[PDB]
Amino acid sequence: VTLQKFNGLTVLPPLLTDEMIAQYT
Amino acid sequence: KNKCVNFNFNGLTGTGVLTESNKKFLPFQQFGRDIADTTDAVRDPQTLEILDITPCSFGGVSVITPGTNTSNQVAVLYQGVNCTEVPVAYSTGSNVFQTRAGCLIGAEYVNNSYECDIPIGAGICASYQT
Amino acid sequence: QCVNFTNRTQLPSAYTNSFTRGVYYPDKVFRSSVLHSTQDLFLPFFSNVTWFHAIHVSGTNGTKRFDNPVLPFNDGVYFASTEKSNIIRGWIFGTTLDSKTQSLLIVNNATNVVIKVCEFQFCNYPFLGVYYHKNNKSWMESEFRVYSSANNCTFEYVSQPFLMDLEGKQGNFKNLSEFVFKNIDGYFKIYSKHTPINLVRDLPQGFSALEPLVDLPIGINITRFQTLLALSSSGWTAGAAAYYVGYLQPRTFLLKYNENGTITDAVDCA
Amino acid sequence: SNNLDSKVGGNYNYLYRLFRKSNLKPFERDISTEIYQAGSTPCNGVKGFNCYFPLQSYGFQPTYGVGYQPYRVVVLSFELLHAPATVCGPKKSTNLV
Amino acid sequence: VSMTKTSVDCTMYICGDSTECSNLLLQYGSFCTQLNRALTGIAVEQDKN
Amino acid sequence: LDPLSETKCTLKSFTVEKGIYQTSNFRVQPTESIVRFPNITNLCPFGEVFNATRFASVYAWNRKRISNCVADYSVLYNSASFSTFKCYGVSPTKLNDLCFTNVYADSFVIRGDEVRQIAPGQTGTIADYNYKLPDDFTGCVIAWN
Numbered sequence: 001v002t003l004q005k006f007n008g009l010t011v012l013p014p015l016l017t018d019e020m021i022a023q024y025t
Numbered sequence: 026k027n028k029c030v031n032f033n034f035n036g037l038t039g040t041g042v043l044t045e046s047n048k049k050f051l052p053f054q055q056f057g058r059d060i061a062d063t064t065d066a067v068r069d070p071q072t073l074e075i076l077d078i079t080p081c082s083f084g085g086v087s088v089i090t091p092g093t094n095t096s097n098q099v100a101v102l103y104q105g106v107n108c109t110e111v112p113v114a115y116s117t118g119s120n121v122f123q124t125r126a127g128c129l130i131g132a133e134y135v136n137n138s139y140e141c142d143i144p145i146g147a148g149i150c151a152s153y154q155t
Numbered sequence: 156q157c158v159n160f161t162n163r164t165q166l167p168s169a170y171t172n173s174f175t176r177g178v179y180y181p182d183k184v185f186r187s188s189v190l191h192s193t194q195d196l197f198l199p200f201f202s203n204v205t206w207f208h209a210i211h212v213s214g215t216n217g218t219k220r221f222d223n224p225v226l227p228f229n230d231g232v233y234f235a236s237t238e239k240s241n242i243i244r245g246w247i248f249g250t251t252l253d254s255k256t257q258s259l260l261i262v263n264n265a266t267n268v269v270i271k272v273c274e275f276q277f278c279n280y281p282f283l284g285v286y287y288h289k290n291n292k293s294w295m296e297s298e299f300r301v302y303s304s305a306n307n308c309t310f311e312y313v314s315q316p317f318l319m320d321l322e323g324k325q326g327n328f329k330n331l332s333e334f335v336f337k338n339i340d341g342y343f344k345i346y347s348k349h350t351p352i353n354l355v356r357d358l359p360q361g362f363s364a365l366e367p368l369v370d371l372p373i374g375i376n377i378t379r380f381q382t383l384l385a386l387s388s389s390g391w392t393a394g395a396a397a398y399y400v401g402y403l404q405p406r407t408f409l410l411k412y413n414e415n416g417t418i419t420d421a422v423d424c425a
Numbered sequence: 426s427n428n429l430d431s432k433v434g435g436n437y438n439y440l441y442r443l444f445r446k447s448n449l450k451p452f453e454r455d456i457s458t459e460i461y462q463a464g465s466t467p468c469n470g471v472k473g474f475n476c477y478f479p480l481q482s483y484g485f486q487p488t489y490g491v492g493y494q495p496y497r498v499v500v501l502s503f504e505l506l507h508a509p510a511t512v513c514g515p516k517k518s519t520n521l522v
Numbered sequence: 523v524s525m526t527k528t529s530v531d532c533t534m535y536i537c538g539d540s541t542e543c544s545n546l547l548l549q550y551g552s553f554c555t556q557l558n559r560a561l562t563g564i565a566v567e568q569d570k571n
Numbered sequence: 572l573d574p575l576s577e578t579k580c581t582l583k584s585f586t587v588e589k590g591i592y593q594t595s596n597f598r599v600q601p602t603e604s605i606v607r608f609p610n611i612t613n614l615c616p617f618g619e620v621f622n623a624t625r626f627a628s629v630y631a632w633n634r635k636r637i638s639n640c641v642a643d644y645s646v647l648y649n650s651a652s653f654s655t656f657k658c659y660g661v662s663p664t665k666l667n668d669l670c671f672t673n674v675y676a677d678s679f680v681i682r683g684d685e686v687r688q689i690a691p692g693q694t695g696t697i698a699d700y701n702y703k704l705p706d707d708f709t710g711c712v713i714a715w716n
């Protein structure tokens with residue numbers, strides 16, 4: 001996989017990190 | 026430079042943190058625009074150098090609360106906001122913490138991983154304990 | 156200094172494809188690693204541009220054929236020349252071109268560019284010319300036959316000076332030079348290029364853009380235009396050069412700006 | 426009101442303002458005669474070069490053309506339906522059921 | 523499984539740096555909060571999913 | 572009053588259940604205005620106008636058309652060198668901030684008891700027989716002993 005601010009647009013973080021997802025996995 | 030201000034360049038009015046750019050523009054240009062087709066840089070027209078127009082910081086204000094039925098004590102999150110900026114606004118501080126989410130105020134960071142209670146984001150949670 | 160020549164030097168022209176030449180920077184705005192689409196007057200891709208070829212005088216001692224017609228100017232013009240010896244030295248643009256009304260004079264003399272907008276009585280076959288090498292080891296403009304009147308000049312600009320001179324050689328046709336001319340609500344704009352080449356015949360296939368050069372608020376109604384070749388009432392010599400002309404259309408162009416913010420490829424969406 | 430206030434020589438009793446630091450606000454009044462400075466110099470007291478008396482009068486004469494004549498004005502301002510009343514138009518009350 | 527959370531300042535989008543636009547947006551009342559509830563609702567289920 | 576009050580108001584409830592809640596956006600305020608324009612390259616040539624070594628007779632009165640230039644009146648209205656300066660259609664204070672399409676500076680000598688005749692809508696031998704301003708004249712007349 002290969003993948004605003006000043007208009008009031010915000011990309012909020014997930015509660016689980018990609019590391020925590022790796023731990024559950 | 027590096028301050029929040031109401032700029033006007035050649036009639037281009039707006040608001041930003043002006044900053045010195047490491048972009049280089051060809052001599053016929055006065056502006057630069059980002060992916061979003063929005064202005065992000067400008068040339069100082071008396072003394073030709075490129076300035077980045079970073080927007081002045083902003084964010085959602087999230088309040089962290091137990092029940093009122095437990096306590097009047099509350100803690101505040103400034104989402105996306107670097108703690109260094111927050112004293113512009115509780116700016117007395119004493120308990121403050123900068124995280125992947127933003128800045129958290131009035132809560133105590135503890136190394137002990139408890140189970141999550143109130144979700145903050147980016148692996149952080151907050152809760153009320155001795 | 157405004158006498159003409161009786162012999163009708165007007166004769167030929169040829170057809171060729173502007174493959175992907177005549178793209179120009181549409182605005183003064185940096186963008187990079189990005190594709191952007193805009194709608195403006197552009198020279199359409201592969202379109203049938205006219206070549207004003209000068210034919211070699213095989214049977215005769217000199218330039219019997221030597222044309223510079225009045226050409227229309229609608230949606231603006233792309234003008235490009237293959238031109239050793241600096242033979243193209245300006246252009247006239249306007250409506251009546253005959254002192255009844257105003258017109259635009261653009262020139263590049265031995266010393267400076269001049270741009271002036273007047274009720275000109277322009278010479279029927281307007282031109283410039285030079286004394287070459289004369290003892291001084293210096294080349295010196297003497298001939299300036301372009302109008303017999305310039306009654307009302309509302310705009311005037313002259314450049315800072317320079318010393319114009321042909322120096323440095325390689326044997327092939329070595330330079331492609333390009334210009335785009337537009338009038339937009341009385342703002343008259345120029346975008347241009349000099350790029351080196353090595354080719355025998357046709358307008359070179361390839362990709363390069365024209366940067367904006369100058370913009371003048373001349374206000375007038377250009378409907379047609381003419382160039383200005385170079386060489387005291389008869390007897391003369393003129394050197395070899397050729398040029399191309401085409402007329403823009405309002406079209407949507409996709410443009411590829413590289414990391415350096417330079418137009419590196421384009422698509423004519425039509 | 427040419428026939429009520431106007432005089433053949435000019436009823437100069439009526440005054441308007443010509444200069445001010447700023448536009449006055451809605452329904453604002455300004456009881457003043459303090460001198461305007463139109464040059465970058467200060468100008469104290471009554472008058473001087475590039476100083477102005479901030480009021481000017483009207484020569485209301487009937488020999489002037491219409492519009493150069495005096496127009497008396499009343500503006501009725503009032504506020505409605507968002508509070509208890511204190512003024513009503515000539516409608517009658519009926520009974521109540 | 524999830525998607526990017528987003529949150530939008532409806533005032534900053536339509537009226538960023540303007541009281542004059544703000545006082546006209548004030549004529550419309552709830553719609554910016556109704557959008558903010560809609561977006562916030564989505565963002566919470568990205569933790570839930 | 573405090574974040575707790577802000578949540579009570581946001582939920583419209585005097586008592587509030589446990590969790591995290593959204594409230595009005597923080598946004599940094601701009602510490603000043605700032606104004607950046609390319610260096611004033613040149614001016615309209617007023618030294619050849621007001622300061623000319625000679626002015627036309629009003630019988631032959633001169634008209635200097637002007638363009639490609641910046642119209643700075645700072646060394647102009649704001650100078651005591653003139654005993655008169657009346658604009659007939661702008662505040663003289665506005666001439667730096669209000670622009671113009673095309674410009675025509677008329678220059679000449681008259682008698683001082685004739686300077687009044689250079690107003691628009693005028694008569695007397697100057698306003699009858701050599702120079703006249705129109706009845707919608709929007710320009711600006713500067714005159715001095």
Ligand SMILES: *[C@@H]1O[C@H](CO)[C@@H](O[C@@H]2O[C@H](CO)[C@@H](O[C@H]3O[C@H](CO)[C@@H](O)[C@H](O)[C@@H]3O)[C@H](O)[C@H]2NC(C)=O)[C@H](O)[C@H]1NC(C)=O
Binds near residue numbers: 216
């Ligand atoms: C070099 O040689 C050329 C050809 O030999 C010569 O061009 C010829 O010049 C003569 C005189 O100007 C022309 O004579 C005719 O001119 C017009 C028609 O063009 C008529 O009105 C005249 O009555 C007369 O018939 C020739 O027509 C012209 N040749 C062509 C076809 O253009 C050059 O003048 C010579 N140059 C030098 C420097 O010697």
Ligand SMILES: *[C@@H]1O[C@H](CO)[C@@H](O[C@@H]2O[C@H](CO)[C@@H](O)[C@H](O)[C@H]2NC(C)=O)[C@H](O)[C@H]1NC(C)=O
Binds near residue numbers: 071072610
């Ligand atoms: C704009 O004006 C400034 C002066 O007002 C010029 O910059 C000066 O350049 C010299 C030579 O390096 C310095 O010693 C001065 O300190 C500079 N002045 C300032 C205010 O920084 C500048 O050259 C002018 N613009 C152009 C295009 O020439």
Ligand SMILES: *[C@@H]1O[C@H](CO)[C@@H](O[C@@H]2O[C@H](CO)[C@@H](O)[C@H](O)[C@H]2NC(C)=O)[C@H](O)[C@H]1NC(C)=O
Binds near residue numbers: 107108109124
């Ligand atoms: C919060 O903002 C400050 C700057 O205002 C950032 O601090 C910099 O951190 C880097 C990385 O260690 C250092 O190279 C700089 O020297 C620091 N500058 C200062 C002035 O302290 C900080 O990184 C920011 N935090 C986030 C998460 O963006």
Ligand SMILES: *[C@@H]1O[C@H](CO)[C@@H](O[C@@H]2O[C@H](CO)[C@@H](O)[C@H](O)[C@H]2NC(C)=O)[C@H](O)[C@H]1NC(C)=O
Binds near residue numbers: 266269295296297
């Ligand atoms: C090239 O054209 C320019 C413009 O006509 C000539 O410049 C003028 O030269 C005379 C004589 O020195 C001066 O009095 C003028 O003031 C110049 N005009 C300007 C606007 O500078 C120039 O002489 C021409 N060059 C040649 C070699 O003919």
Ligand SMILES: *[C@@H]1O[C@H](CO)[C@@H](O[C@@H]2O[C@H](CO)[C@@H](O)[C@H](O)[C@H]2NC(C)=O)[C@H](O)[C@H]1NC(C)=O
Binds near residue numbers: 306307
């Ligand atoms: C530019 O000059 C021409 C010629 O002097 C002016 O044309 C004259 O205009 C007046 C007024 O319409 C007529 O009475 C003359 O008969 C015209 N003569 C000619 C030869 O055209 C023209 O008006 C001038 N334009 C400007 C803006 O000054």
Ligand SMILES: *[C@@H]1O[C@H](CO)[C@@H](O[C@@H]2O[C@H](CO)[C@@H](O)[C@H](O)[C@H]2NC(C)=O)[C@H](O)[C@H]1NC(C)=O
Binds near residue numbers: 413414415
């Ligand atoms: C954009 O232009 C720059 C400058 O011409 C190019 O960077 C140069 O690349 C060469 C080859 O590696 C170096 O010798 C130069 O020193 C570089 N210049 C600088 C200022 O570092 C760059 O390659 C160009 N990019 C593209 C995509 O054409």
Ligand SMILES: *[C@@H]1O[C@H](CO)[C@@H](O)[C@H](O)[C@H]1NC(C)=O
Binds near residue numbers: 094095
């Ligand atoms: C709320 O707290 C009060 C004391 O402040 C207590 O009387 C009540 O039982 C509590 N109710 C709940 C549901 O927590």
Ligand SMILES: *[C@@H]1O[C@H](CO)[C@@H](O)[C@H](O)[C@H]1NC(C)=O
Binds near residue numbers: 136
């Ligand atoms: C918690 O542990 C970290 C290292 O993981 C250390 O940097 C930090 O000082 C510790 N905090 C306390 C309160 O001991």
Ligand SMILES: *[C@@H]1O[C@H](CO)[C@@H](O)[C@H](O)[C@H]1NC(C)=O
Binds near residue numbers: 170171202
């Ligand atoms: C160019 O256009 C004309 C029609 O206007 C046509 O006769 C001619 O064959 C075309 N040829 C080229 C090469 O463009």
Ligand SMILES: *[C@@H]1O[C@H](CO)[C@@H](O)[C@H](O)[C@H]1NC(C)=O
Binds near residue numbers: 286289290291
């Ligand atoms: C050489 O230049 C001078 C002026 O610099 C000129 O007077 C003279 O005529 C020139 N000589 C020739 C042969 O062109």
Ligand SMILES: *[C@@H]1O[C@H](CO)[C@@H](O)[C@H](O)[C@H]1NC(C)=O
Binds near residue numbers: 374375376
């Ligand atoms: C330019 O041409 C148009 C169409 O004829 C006309 O409306 C306009 O007034 C002309 N302007 C000038 C300066 O002649």
Ligand SMILES: *[C@@H]1O[C@H](CO)[C@@H](O)[C@H](O)[C@H]1NC(C)=O
Binds near residue numbers: 618621622647
């Ligand atoms: C005009 O220039 C002279 C010097 O040449 C100066 O003394 C005078 O004050 C100037 N006047 C104005 C109105 O600028």
